[PDB]
Ligand binder design. Sequence first.
Ligand SMILES: CCCCCCCCCCCCO[C@@H]1O[C@H](CO)[C@@H](O[C@H]2O[C@H](CO)[C@@H](O)[C@H](O)[C@H]2O)[C@H](O)[C@H]1O
Ligand SMILES: CCCCCCCCCCCC
Ligand SMILES: CCCCCCCCCC
Ligand SMILES: CCCCCCCC
Ligand SMILES: CCCCCC
Lengths: 451, 127
Amino acid sequence: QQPRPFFMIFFVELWERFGYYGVQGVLAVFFVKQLGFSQEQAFVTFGAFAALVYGLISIGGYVGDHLLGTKRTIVLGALVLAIGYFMTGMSLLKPDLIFIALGTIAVGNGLFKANPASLLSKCYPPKDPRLDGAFTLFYMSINIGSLIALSLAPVIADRFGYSVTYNLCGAGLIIALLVYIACRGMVKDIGSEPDFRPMSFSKLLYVLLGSVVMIFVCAWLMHNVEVANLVLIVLSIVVTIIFFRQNKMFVAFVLMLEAVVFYILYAQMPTSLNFFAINNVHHEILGFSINPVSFQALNPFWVVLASPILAGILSMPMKFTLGMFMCSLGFLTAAAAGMWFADAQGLTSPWFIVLVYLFQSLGELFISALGLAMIAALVMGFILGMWFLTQAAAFLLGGYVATFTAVPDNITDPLETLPVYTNVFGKIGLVTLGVAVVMLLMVPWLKRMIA
Amino acid sequence: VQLVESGGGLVQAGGSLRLSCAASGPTLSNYAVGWFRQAPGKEREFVAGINWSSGLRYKDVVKGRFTVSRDNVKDTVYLQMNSLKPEDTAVYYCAARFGGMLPLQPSGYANWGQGTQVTVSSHHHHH
Ligand SMILES: CCCCCCCCCCCCO[C@@H]1O[C@H](CO)[C@@H](O[C@H]2O[C@H](CO)[C@@H](O)[C@H](O)[C@H]2O)[C@H](O)[C@H]1O
Ligand SMILES: CCCCCCCCCCCC
Ligand SMILES: CCCCCCCCCC
Ligand SMILES: CCCCCCCC
Ligand SMILES: CCCCCC
């Protein structure tokens, strides 16, 4: 159906996302069990990590477009990522390495993430109709990798240990790099402008220097989440002031605040919803025993099933409003499952978590996938920067919100943890329903301003 | 995923026994291990357990007599039972659940040992 480089990009993206989600799925449990963090420390540390992973994505588009070229930056990102995974594996011998290792994944992801999609859009003549379907298949690539990693990495880490899990993340990046090198012949005339001049060693060295400095800055911020909190607070207040000094822009600002709320909620899947599954859900579905950490795989699962359907089925403000209502219902469903449908022992049916993740995945399909592509219609570089900044702030806020469900290590009774989860998830659901309603109320004004 | 219990047997009232539970491929260290017991004519009931981070839970009638503990190097969980009484007689099972929770009922646990018979005799020496 598609050009030959499409299949290359599809499989490279699949394997890189497999490595990343291999780490994401096990990381909070690794903090608690392997490093002995309390749940509170593990949740805010995960929030800082994810804030860096997501905020740094802006660097890689610039580096790919203007310094080194898209294809060279794919190679460099994949190598830094692989090194970061093998470093995380080595942190089990050398525990003092963990934060440097996570910084290396973050910087690596920052260099890599934007560039495969950019490459993909250059595989098609400019207004080729196959573009939409190819980008839907690209999203599905990401979620197939995510589904495999979130399903299997917890099982692997339990049977064989963490060093093996992280080294297989490493190995996934290595085979992504092998697939890319084997298929390089396919993209020889595809690239950004620096891809076709000789490589500038001055700029390559500047990129390496900046990368290493950022690896160390990330490590520091993740080890001291309070200064990271204040850094993002002053950066947000300040970038907000410089945005409020300099109509279709105000629309992008309200849509950004709504994206912020969405990502606060998305941040709960590896933290508070993960430990909710661990503590208060039956670990058996359809007669099979599973690792409860694997329940995270229900998000890519429902995306893979639902992204065809929803691709084959107002406009932007209403699509955002709908996504927000779906997220609200996901959390209200978790709360209702805990308030009314639990066993005498304090455990709930896994079908309720299946439904929670369905709602959350639908919200994802309506919001995060459809976000910056019609913020790219409302608009540039400053706004893209601020977009990733507020996304990072959302992950930091999400880690802080997760701490309200944190369980002390000595609690062993599910009837003690169930009400903590149900109070926090119920209040999240109600706040998010309120926000969805105010969004609905503002949809006509927003549509008129877009016009 | 398969637990092996050892240590059961026959003892007189006021004596002691020590059960042990070991797992095979999965590392028991990620698991809360609960000890259940089934006496003749009754249901499996929760006796004692340790979660994955040293939290402990006990049935009221064994407090101050039984101690659960964990050797994370040998990957073993132990149940030390002192001041045993005849009504402690039962088949004892270890059960494993991923995480920090020790639910009271058998359905909260997916992995099960085969069970060891513990018999406590009112036997005392002749005066
Ligand atoms: C909700 C999404 C579930 C994702 C599906 C998981 C993928 C299947 C795992 C790979 C093949 C099966 O491998 C194994 O199967 C048994 C029973 O099936 C499961 O069960 C066993 O291992 C896990 C952790 O490793 C323990 O929490 C579990 O209590 C234990 O009984 C595990 O899931 C998996 O270790
Ligand atoms: C394709 C050519 C790749 C050349 C790699 C140069 C690496 C320079 C290392 C400088 C170390 C700081
Ligand atoms: C690859 C660099 C490894 C650095 C490990 C630092 C850990 C020191 C522990 C005392
Ligand atoms: C395709 C060649 C990219 C070179 C970047 C590697 C720098 C270590
Ligand atoms: C944008 C809301 C920030 C809240 C920090 C307490």
